[PDB]
Design a protein around this ligand. Structure first.
Ligand SMILES: [Zn+2]
Lengths: 218, 129, 208, 23, 98, 83, 71, 83, 129
RNA sequence: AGAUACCGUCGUAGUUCCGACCAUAAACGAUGCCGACCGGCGAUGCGGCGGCGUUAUUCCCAUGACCCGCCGGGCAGCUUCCGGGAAACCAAAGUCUUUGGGUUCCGGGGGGAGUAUGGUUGCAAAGCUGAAACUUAAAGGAAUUGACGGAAGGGCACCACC
């Protein structure tokens, strides 16, 4: 099965850190993929955004490598987006998922402007861009559904974001860019100094301190 | 007359001299027989090409330790050379130079230590453009 | 930094510093480094506030001692001047030293000939002991550098303003820094000279 | 080429002006 | 694009500099763009210096040097092999070669 | 940040810097928590407790990590000695 | 890079009344010479007799003889 | 984070700025007295003179305006900044 | 030259907040600018500031705080007929939940939430969030 | 092969000068004006200032010439993930979905075209203003891998030469 090469994996396999929260507060790197599958194997539903074949010239027959775009989500507050290239579409589609699980980031869902019930939309107007694709997320009232192209209508949905207006920049044809941007925006919810925040945080002894007494074991 | 012995020979020979450094010598004929006893060399030729590098490599190690192998009888020589301890000479016994502004840092630290005074403020030469 | 006979600056320590020329810096001042330069005399070389060095050298000591396990801190040196010293620091403290060429990717690249995940870097020189300063960004690593008056202060948490060009200056402070990180944990009454001299940490070629 | 084309078309106009002297 | 931030010229903050004819084919390049060389050479180059010492009337003679300031057009320069193309990172450095 | 009943429906509260009050993101990697021990100030021995700090990954790239640890240490009574 | 003033409403307006003419999708649909050269009078359909029956080839990539009429 | 006081800077950084860029601007010149060589009628004279001054007590020139600061012909008592 | 002396001051702090400084100085001063920053300080978006005085103009120093995200200015000074106010705070703000827009008014300078209670309008100045 | 071309000997207009026309150039930094802000560094030009020594004088002195720094305004340079951008690159091409300092000119796929006509300036060459019919699915920018070079740098082969 799974004997780890990381301290986190050492500390994780033994049930000693319970949730991605404690992994996300200190923004520890996720160096193995089994960490998330131990926390989130259920509802980690795979999908394949596209399989784009790219070709590199050569003096011999022009070579071909395929690309696999896979997002991962739970409709409850996490989203990933992985890419990969290889000379066989079976490993590219297998490798994309693993790289997609590693890039999993938390998303914050807020209210449109009335503060009763479960969160249902992006907190505030967030945006991102890679390769000129500029996906804006604009808060929406409860019970509207998502409004966007089929590509980021998925990335947003896997976050559990029920109702989010959006507006996109020109040149969205390339899923390598249009999916990357809409993933970049949802990562950017826990990056706003909102007036809801500003309550002084108290640093709470990153797992390596509290759990070094066992972690010196061999 | 000779060739580059590839990474097969160079890696094989470096481990031998790293594991049996005491049982080896200077002369090829001695080393040829030794290698067969301690290593299962598949081919007659390469055994005489491994034994070739070993005797060439010993001619290296007697002439200033080199950067390839780890020898315990040579390493212990280093640790005696890296743990040497004379009577303290870092203390700089009495009056030792301090530049004129250095004592002013000390008198601002309120230290009455004894040291030297020069004069150097007239500037007469420094960096080049 | 403190109020002790054993914590505040002692004449015995200051004679050590002036002996090995820790106060002479270089000919340049980096804008992050102005807060540790007393004045510039007329030959064109900078004088370091040895007291300000003490606070930082005591602050850096307070950083290391907080680490629960001695092995969790990786002390790294990539100049031939201080290679022997950092070996001695781990010997008298219990650190995991790194002398010689820094294999790029010892903190990343899981599948590694040499792999560590430490909790604190201690780099001799920010300029020439380069890589660990940059591999201390891909995983969350605090940094402790004996910063000169010319070394950049990028990706460094604690800057001990000191001369580090000469062999004497670096050898001193590795002995000096080791003395402070040890004492706060307990080796002597603190009312004694520590029985190992700085020359043990000094650089020396075979010369009899 | 870009310029020599501009010389032909400048030459060609002078043909067109000149054959309005004929009427 | 932009191969060189200098455009190949050494002109910054002025109009046009006087043009100096090439000292091989006589191509009219401006004094900035041209590749300037200053070769000092003995008139009596080493293949014969001692053969002159034997036949010199004076006891102490130094065989005075020769001073010519050569200007090259870019085309006349590459062909004569004074300079050459360089890699897009090694292109940057401007210190004279050792 | 709240609910209809006022319950805090949120995954967590992300840590905040100690020199710019910026938010260390959940996938930032140059940003560190740091600990500075204490002494009893009568014998110098390690007095158990710890001083916590944080620095966003932007500051360390700009080189202002130490100048911010210092100002925090002067204010919190770790270093009090002046020039 | 803009007027953006508060008593400038005329210049923002006599600029856009001027630069609209470069939108060929608008120059055609608003200039009398575009519709004039249309064989239809702008109509959807148009009747007319057949005065011969001719065929016409196809472009380079694929060959054929498309059948047509000279209405 | 290069957090330094723009309100209370050293009385010696204020000379490391233009005549205008200081905290509260003030001229770099200073009104000075001169003892009028040979006589005891002591007159005022402005440090950055742009005009000569002639003394009935001297009948010879006193201050010579060169550049952007005056040069005095003969040394005299020079009070300063009584303003 | 300088035209919208409110605009330059806000860009001076906005560019200084982005870098991460604690204090910033702005070159001109005005009641329009002093009554501006007080609106922020009355919400806690900034620290506590000082107003250097001269005979010429005055130069404000502000003790910035890491709480404001962006501090824009909106020019020309438009109007807000209290029926367009809901359009403005939806195409110029991050969300309804937070962030305020400040608009001058016959009853002084005040952020838009004040305008709703006092049930008035007037020209608009800028915004922050 | 042709060579009304490159190459070489001649050679008119022209080149230079005084007095008027012409108003065009990759007239380029292919990068509007004015105003503010955000990193360091070593130098360069001019002005003023503070400086310890030297050198010109017999005297600080007037003043040069060196040597250390500061301040303003310039021509520009090195480095950095501040930050932009399609990227090559940029302390501006930054402060741009978190868009609004003030103001001028100008572009809307490529071709027909800077053509026809009309107006206007010009002694002439021409300049300024300036369409449509029709045609076409791509024109076009930066980087990446190859191929190719009558492109340079190393090196090997009698299916290559000496
Ligand atoms: Zn030539």
């Amino acid at each position: 099965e799974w004997m780890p090469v990381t301290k986190l994996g050492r500390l994780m396999k033994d049930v000693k850190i319970k949730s991605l929260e404690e992994i996300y507060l200190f923004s520890l790197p996720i160096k193995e993929s089994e960490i998330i599958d131990f926390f989130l194997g259920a509802s980690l539903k795979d999908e394949v955004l596209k399989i784009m074949p790219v070709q590199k010239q050569t003096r011999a027959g022009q070579r071909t490598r395929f690309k696999a775009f896979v997002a991962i989500g739970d409709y409850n507050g996490h989203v990933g987006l992985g890419v990969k290239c290889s000379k066989e579409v079976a490993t590219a589609i297998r490798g994309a998922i693993i790289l997609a699980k590693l890039s999993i980031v938390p998303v914050r869902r807020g209210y449109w402007g009335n503060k009763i019930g479960k969160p249902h939309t992006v907190p505030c107007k967030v945006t991102g861009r890679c390769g000129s694709v500029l996906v804006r997320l604009i808060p929406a009232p409860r019970g509207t559904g998502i409004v966007s192209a089929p590509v980021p209508k998925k990335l947003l949905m896997m976050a559990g974001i029920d109702d989010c207006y959006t507006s996109a920049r020109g040149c969205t044809a390339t899923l390598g860019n249009f999916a990357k941007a809409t993933f970049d925006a949802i990562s950017k919810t826990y990056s706003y100094l909102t007036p809801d925040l500003w309550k002084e945080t108290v640093f709470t002894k990153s797992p390596y301190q509290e759990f070094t007494d066992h972690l010196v074991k061999t | 007359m000779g060739r580059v012995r590839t990474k097969t020979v160079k890696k094989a020979a470096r481990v031998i001299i790293e594991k049996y450094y005491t049982r080896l010598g200077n002369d090829f004929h001695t080393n040829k027989r030794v290698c067969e006893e301690i290593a299962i060399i598949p081919s007659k030729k390469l055994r005489n090409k491994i034994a070739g590098y070993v005797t060439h490599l010993m001619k290296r190690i007697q002439r200033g330790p080199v950067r390839g192998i780890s020898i315990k009888l040579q390493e212990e020589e280093r640790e005696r050379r890296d743990n040497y301890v004379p009577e303290v000479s870092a203390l700089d016994q009495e009056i030792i130079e301090v530049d004129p502004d250095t004592k002013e840092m000390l008198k601002l630290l309120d230290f009455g230590s004894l040291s030297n005074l020069q004069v150097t403020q007239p500037t007469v030469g420094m960096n080049f453009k | 930094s403190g109020a002790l006979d054993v914590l505040q600056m002692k004449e015995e320590d200051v004679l050590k510093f002036l002996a090995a020329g820790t106060h002479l810096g270089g000919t340049n001042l980096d804008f992050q480094m102005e807060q540790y330069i007393y004045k510039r005399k007329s030959d064109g070389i900078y004088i370091i506030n040895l007291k300000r060095t003490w606070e930082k050298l005591l602050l850096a000591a307070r950083a290391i001692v907080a680490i629960e396990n001695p092995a969790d801190v990786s002390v790294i040196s990539s100049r031939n001047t201080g290679q022997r010293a950092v070996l001695k620091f781990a010997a008298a403290t219990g650190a995991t030293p790194i002398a010689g060429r820094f294999t790029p990717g010892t903190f990343t690249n899981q599948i590694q000939t040499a792999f560590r995940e430490p909790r604190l870097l201690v780099v001799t020189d920010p300029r020439a002991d380069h890589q660990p300063l940059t591999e201390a960004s891909y995983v969350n690593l605090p940094t402790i550098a004996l910063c000169n008056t010319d070394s950049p202060l990028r990706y460094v948490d604690i800057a001990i303003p000191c001369n580090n060009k000469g062999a004497h200056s670096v050898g001193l402070m590795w002995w000096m820094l080791a003395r402070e990180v040890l004492r706060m944990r307990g080796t002597i009454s603190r009312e004694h000279p520590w029985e190992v001299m700085p020359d043990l940490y000094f650089y020396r070629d075979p010369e009899e | 080429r870009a310029k020599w084309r501009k010389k032909r078309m400048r030459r060609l106009k002078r043909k067109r002006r000149k054959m309005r002297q004929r009427s | 694009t932009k191969k060189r931030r200098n455009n190949g010229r050494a002109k910054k903050g002025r109009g046009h500099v006087q043009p100096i004819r090439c000292t091989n084919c006589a191509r009219c390049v401006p004094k900035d763009k041209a590749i300037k060389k200053f070769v000092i050479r003995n008139i009596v180059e080493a293949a014969a210096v001692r053969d002159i010492s034997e036949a010199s009337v004076f006891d102490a003679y130094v065989l005075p040097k020769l001073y010519v300031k050569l200007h090259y057009c870019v085309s006349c320069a590459i062909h004569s092999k004074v300079v050459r193309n360089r890699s897009r990172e090694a292109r940057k450095d401007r210190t004279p070669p050792p | 940040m709240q609910s209809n009943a006022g319950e805090f429906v949120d995954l967590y509260v992300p840590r905040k810097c100690s020199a710019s009050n910026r938010i260390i993101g959940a996938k930032d990697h140059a940003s560190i928590p740091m600990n500075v021990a204490e002494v009893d100030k009568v014998t110098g021995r390690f007095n158990g407790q710890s001083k916590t700090y944080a620095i966003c990954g932007a500051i360390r790239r700009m080189g202002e990590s130490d100048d911010s640890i210092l100002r925090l240490a002067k204010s919190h009574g770790i270093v009090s000695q002046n020039f | 890079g803009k007027c953006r003033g508060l008593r400038t409403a005329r210049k923002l307006r006599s600029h856009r009344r001027d630069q609209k003419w470069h939108d060929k999708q608008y120059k055609k649909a608003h200039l009398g010479t575009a519709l004039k050269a249309n064989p239809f009078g702008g109509a959807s359909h148009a009747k007319g007799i057949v005065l011969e029956k001719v065929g016409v080839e196809a472009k380079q990539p694929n060959s054929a003889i498309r059948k047509c009429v000279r209405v | 984070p290069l957090a330094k006081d723009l309100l209370h800077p050293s009385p010696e950084e204020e000379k490391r700025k233009h005549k205008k860029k200081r905290l509260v601007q003030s001229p770099n010149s200073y009104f000075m007295d001169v003892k009028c060589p040979g006589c005891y009628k002591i007159t005022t004279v402005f440090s950055h003179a742009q005009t000569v001054v002639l003394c009935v007590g001297c009948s010879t020139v006193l201050c010579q305006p060169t550049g952007g600061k005056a040069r005095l012909t003969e040394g005299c008592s020079f009070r300063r900044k009584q303003h | 030259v300088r035209m919208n002396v409110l605009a330059d001051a806000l860009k001076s702090i906005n560019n200084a907040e982005k870098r991460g400084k604690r204090q910033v100085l702005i070159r001109p001063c005005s009641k329009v600018i002093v009554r501006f920053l007080t609106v922020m300080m009355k919400h806690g978006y900034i620290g506590e500031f000082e107003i250097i005085d001269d005979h010429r103009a005055g130069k404000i120093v502000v003790n910035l705080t890491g709480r404001l995200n962006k501090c824009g200015v909106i020019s020309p000074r438009f109007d807000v007929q209290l029926k367009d106010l809901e359009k403005w705070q939806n195409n110029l703000l991050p969300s309804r939940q937070f962030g305020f827009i400040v608009l001058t008014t016959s009853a002084g300078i005040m952020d838009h939430e004040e305008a709703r209670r006092k049930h008035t309008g007037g020209k608009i100045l800028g915004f922050f969030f």
